[PDB]
């Protein structure tokens, strides 16, 4: 009853995040292919896509319960394929920033993919359910990478053509979602689901903002010249690294009741201390090593939260619940990239800014480390 | 507003060398991958050689390739290009360009479109 909805929108996810594109963009864009400025794609594409997903998750979040959400993941799909049609044929700023329009319209739409599955399944698949929906995009990422390398380096695939086989992907994405079946028909009074919530709109804005200066802060410490290789190949390692820790929360039998909590605070801490493990040490393997249990970790509590989450929720506002925590978050980390990185604010290098974020990340931590007065 | 400014040009006979300075200023030397363009008399400016910010890759033109030495110096926020066994076809007013983003290298953005914020130039008359 429950291994259909969940085969789908497994494929469904699994074919959607497949997108061997990804991890060369600026390098199309910028390429002999469309001819866009390094000023013009920082400046005038790229944030479009910030303001466009900060907007468009306000009528996601508002309005995806009551279309009961395959609506909006059909949207998703749709978003999807006139995103990569027009980043194919679409030439030009302005074409550029419609695309990124429809790309946060994209990833605002992507609070129906995890908001959706509970809707249809019982309460006693919830754990299982949530760990196999957050392994597929996670390994379906990390399949595309690996294929967008060997490809671009042993079929010297072009960046067209790896264009292409997104689009193919996503338009197969869109075909199974039509499969999809259609579910039937003020709310953080709990704490469990308050500071689930809270630790995901604090370490959601803060992951997201280290994952822009990891590849930054390995040719700081080791310039080499073939570090491009070696960045993308433990982007993808660290993202399959998540992938089976996602996959495992689903599998292990552990009493989730009693283990919510401390699963915070042990793993929060292992998210700051694998921060300061790559500021402070000088071999790159060590950052490497780094970088893979940090996002690793974050994967592995992102999948309780949702599996936790919905089960405290007693009403079916699984796209709010979710919908407003990767909005703050949003709001939290483009304040915080203002303050940090932006010139207007303090500009600080990336020699010290895992400092900040490895500083930022032990708050978190000891916030939900002292909740135990005696 | 970034500054940047050229010093090095000058007649040079042939077979001699140069070496050329480029001491950037309001910009923070230490993130951008600086570069060297040329614009011979009648032609486009031309990518020539290109010293990525953490200073381990340096691109070169295929003419210029093997005489050229692109190096910098953050701590005077300075840059210079080293060119030896000058011919009368390197002839040219040339740019110190500043990369319009910071890291540049890192995120991958192609070099022959990557710099921007000229300078003023210096002129090298390589005289057979």
């Known amino acids: 009853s429950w291994i259909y909805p969940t085969v789908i929108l497994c494929l469904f996810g699994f074919f959607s995040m497949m997108r061997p594109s990804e991890p060369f963009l600026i390098p199309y864009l910028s390429g002999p292919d469309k001819n866009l400025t390094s000023a013009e794609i920082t400046n005038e594409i790229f944030p479009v896509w910030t303001y466009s997903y900060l907007v468009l998750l306000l009528p996601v979040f508002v309005l995806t319960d009551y279309v009961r959400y395959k609506p909006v993941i059909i949207l998703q799909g749709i978003s999807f394929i006139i995103t990569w049609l027009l980043l194919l044929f679409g030439q030009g700023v302005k074409t550029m920033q419609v695309v990124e329009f429809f790309y946060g319209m994209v990833t605002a739409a992507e609070v129906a993919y995890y908001a959706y599955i509970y809707s249809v399944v019982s309460p006693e698949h919830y754990q299982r359910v949530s760990g196999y929906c957050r392994s597929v995009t996670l390994a379906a990422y990390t399949a595309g990478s690996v294929l967008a390398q060997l490809l671009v380096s042993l079929a010297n695939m072009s960046y067209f053509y790896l264009n292409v086989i997104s689009l193919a992907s996503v338009s197969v994405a869109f075909l199974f979602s039509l499969f999809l079946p259609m579910p039937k028909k003020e709310c953080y009074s709990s704490k469990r689901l308050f500071y689930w919530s809270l630790w995901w709109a604090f370490a959601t804005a803060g992951f997201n903002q280290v994952l822009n200066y990891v590849q930054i802060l390995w040719d700081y410490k080791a310039p080499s010249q073939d570090s491009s290789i070696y960045n993308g190949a433990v982007e993808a390692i660290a993202t399959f690294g998540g992938a089976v820790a996602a996959f495992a929360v689903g599998y292990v039998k552990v009493n989730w009741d009693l283990l919510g909590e401390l699963a915070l605070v042990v793993f929060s801490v292992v998210n700051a201390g694998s921060l300061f493990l790559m500021h402070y040490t000088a071999n790159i393997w060590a950052c490497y090593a780094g970088y893979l249990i940090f996002k690793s970790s974050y994967m592995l509590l992102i999948t309780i939260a949702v599996f936790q989450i919905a089960v405290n929720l007693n009403v079916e506002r699984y796209a709010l619940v979710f919908g407003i925590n990767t909005f703050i978050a949003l709001v939290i980390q483009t304040i915080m990239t203002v303050i940090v990185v932006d010139q207007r604010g303090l500009n600080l290098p990336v020699s010290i800014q895992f400092l900040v974020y490895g500083s930022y990340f032990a708050v978190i931590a000891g916030i939900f480390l002292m909740r135990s007065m005696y | 507003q970034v500054q940047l400014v050229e010093s090095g040009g000058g007649l040079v006979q042939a077979g001699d060398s140069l070496r050329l300075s480029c001491a950037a200023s309001?910009?923070?030397?230490?993130?951008?991958?600086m570069a060297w363009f040329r614009q011979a008399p009648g032609k486009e400016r031309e990518f020539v050689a290109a010293?990525?910010?953490?200073?381990?890759?340096?691109d070169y033109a295929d003419s210029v390739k093997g005489r050229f030495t692109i190096s910098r110096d953050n701590a005077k926020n300075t840059i210079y290009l080293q060119m030896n066994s000058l011919k009368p076809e390197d002839t040219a007013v040339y740019y110190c360009?500043?990369?319009?983003?910071?890291?540049?290298?890192?995120?991958?953005?192609?070099?022959?479109?990557?710099?921007?914020?000229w300078g003023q130039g210096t002129q090298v008359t390589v005289s057979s």
């Open positions: 360009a500043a990369a319009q983003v910071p890291y540049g290298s890192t995120l991958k953005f192609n070099l022959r479109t990557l710099f921007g914020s």
């Open positions: 309001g910009l923070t030397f230490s993130r951008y991958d």
């Open positions: 010293i990525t910010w953490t200073g381990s890759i340096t």
